[PDB]
Design a protein around this ligand. Structure first.
Ligand SMILES: *[C@@H]1O[C@H](CO)[C@@H](O)[C@H](O)[C@H]1NC(C)=O
Ligand SMILES: *[C@@H]1O[C@H](CO)[C@@H](O)[C@H](O)[C@H]1NC(C)=O
Ligand SMILES: *[C@@H]1O[C@H](CO)[C@@H](O)[C@H](O)[C@H]1NC(C)=O
Ligand SMILES: [Ca+2]
Length: 488
């Protein structure tokens, strides 16, 4: 059953985005996030207008001229040289992937194959200008003795480092894509130099021994860039590091060929050592976490992005093995969606390793559920994450099998039927509950940038943004689903 764009399906996703935007624009804008039930807002993203920037490119790919214009008019107004709140900490990582990524992807799209969605060239130019302004403040993060970025900085009263003594590999290794992109766009090499230097310490790990070739530790010293542990996983604190390794290779196969080699070691090592099968459902394959040569039968929604990453690597390297493994991953993680009462996957889940017998024991209430489902829930909530829709999307782009679109559709449908709340959509309390267990009154910006973006693209018409299975990709998605043009 060969696939093809599904207008009806794509329209539904576009409609969910429209609703979410209207509500956000009316009750929260220009604040960072909307609380759909109370109709209030928050500024978790330092009050720069997180949801507006994060959703900008999604609005461009959907052909939402009006929404695009609204945001473009706002960009020049943002003040990326300070924070409304004095002495307020700023996450180098979160700020980078959302703001810098969002501004750069919008810039690349509005100057590339989507330039029609914008007429005012001065507004388009603001995106890049504002990105450089932001980066000029964020760069203080690299003023550590080793060059390894400090995870937190401050802009108000002045630009300063938090002074942390260590950081995690995910936050250190998820800056290279957008900072290198910025240098290429501005002509100022400093940005790339800074990010790449901090990254260098992660490519030739010194200190704690690698659990396995390519599988590095989680925390790195800011004073000397050495590792102090041998633990890690494909989820929180490490996930996006492995992701950007292969993505940099897409951005420029020559300059970052070494990044590609570090990915292959990681990939091969997680396949031979992290792949785990639930004792009650051997046909399923999940990724365990690790510490030394020991692995733990636990995972969650964050690690579900893995499927798409292995697939991406298989495309860029013409290696079926990575594609097959990625397909299995996408499928297995979707099983945590399709088997709950709401049809939505849990935040955290666990199982019993079928080989080492490791892992706990299903809590009494989930005893029967584990027997047939192959996992039990440890963290029931869902906050509109996109990792699974992301992996399903890659699975479809590489196979062309409409079956994947059906799974994604089942995923989007389950999500809106339970997350539909107040003026738009919201995080839910209990996924193992048919109705979702009640909304927690929150609509994260990545709902706009990622979940709705991947859901739409899997049903949408062809374009340069779509990932090409037979190579020739001209774009690369950053960790927050913001596509950048490759070096060229
Ligand atoms: C941005 O904020 C800083 C500090 O409050 C201020 O000095 C500057 O004038 C502001 N810039 C704009 C464009 O208002
Ligand atoms: C947008 O383009 C118009 C041209 O019609 C220009 O007058 C305006 O200044 C631009 N936006 C801003 C305020 O930078
Ligand atoms: C590196 O710095 C850390 C502090 O973060 C310290 O514990 C460690 O001993 C240093 N390593 C060496 C040998 O320089
Ligand atoms: Ca991500």
């Amino acid at each position: 059953k060969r696939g093809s764009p599904n207008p009806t399906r794509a329209a539904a996703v576009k409609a969910a985005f429209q609703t979410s935007w209207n509500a956000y624009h009316h009750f929260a804008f220009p604040h960072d996030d909307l609380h759909p039930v109370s109709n209030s807002f928050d500024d978790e993203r330092n009050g720069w207008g997180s949801s507006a920037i994060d959703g900008l490119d999604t609005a461009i790919l959907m052909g939402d001229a009006d929404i695009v214009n609204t945001i473009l008019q706002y960009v020049p107004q943002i003040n990326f040289t300070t924070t409304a709140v004095a002495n307020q900490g700023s996450s180098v990582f979160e700020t980078n992937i959302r703001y810098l990524g969002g501004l750069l992807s919008a810039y690349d799209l509005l100057r590339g194959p989507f330039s029609s969605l914008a007429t005012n060239q001065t507004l388009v130019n603001s995106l890049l200008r504002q990105a450089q302004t932001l980066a000029n403040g964020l760069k203080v993060a690299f003023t550590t003795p080793s060059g390894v970025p400090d995870p937190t900085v401050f802009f108000n009263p002045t630009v300063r480092r938090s002074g942390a003594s260590s950081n995690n590999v995910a936050e250190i290794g998820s800056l290279v894509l957008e900072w290198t992109r910025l240098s290429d766009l501005t002509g100022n090499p400093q940005y790339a130099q800074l990010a790449q230097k901090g990254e260098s310490y992660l490519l030739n790990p010194k200190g704690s021994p690698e659990a396995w070739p390519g599988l590095i530790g989680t925390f790195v010293s800011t004073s000397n860039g050495t590792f102090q542990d041998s633990s890690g996983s494909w989820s929180g604190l490490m996930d996006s590091f492995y992701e950007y390794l292969i993505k940099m290779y897409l951005y420029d196969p020559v300059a970052f060929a070494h990044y590609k080699d570090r990915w292959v070691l990681g990939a091969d090592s997680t396949i031979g050592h992290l792949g785990s099968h639930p004792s009650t459902r051997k046909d399923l394959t999940f990724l365990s976490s690790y510490n030394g040569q020991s692995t733990s039968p636990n995972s969650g929604h964050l690690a579900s992005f893995g499927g798409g990453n292995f697939i991406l690597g298989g495309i860029l390297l013409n290696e079926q093995k990575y594609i097959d493994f990625g397909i299995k991953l996408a499928s297995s993680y979707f099983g945590t969606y399709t088997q709950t009462a709401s049809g939505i996957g849990p935040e955290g889940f666990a199982w019993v390793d079928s080989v080492t017998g490791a892992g706990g024991s299903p809590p009494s209430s989930q005893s029967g559920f584990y027997s047939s489902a192959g996992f039990w829930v440890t963290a029931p909530y869902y906050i509109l994450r996109p990792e699974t829709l992301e992996s399903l999307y890659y699975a479809y782009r590489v196979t062309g099998d409409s079956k994947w679109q059906d799974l994604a559709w089942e995923a989007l449908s389950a999500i809106e039927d339970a997350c539909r709340a107040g003026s738009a959509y919201s995080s839910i309390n209990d996924v193992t509950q048919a109705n979702g267990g009640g909304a927690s009154d929150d609509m994260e910006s990545f709902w706009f940038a990622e979940a709705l973006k991947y859901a739409y693209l899997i049903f949408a018409e062809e374009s340069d943004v779509q990932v090409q299975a037979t190579g020739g990709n001209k774009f690369v998605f950053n960790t927050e689903a913001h596509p950048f043009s490759i070096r060229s």
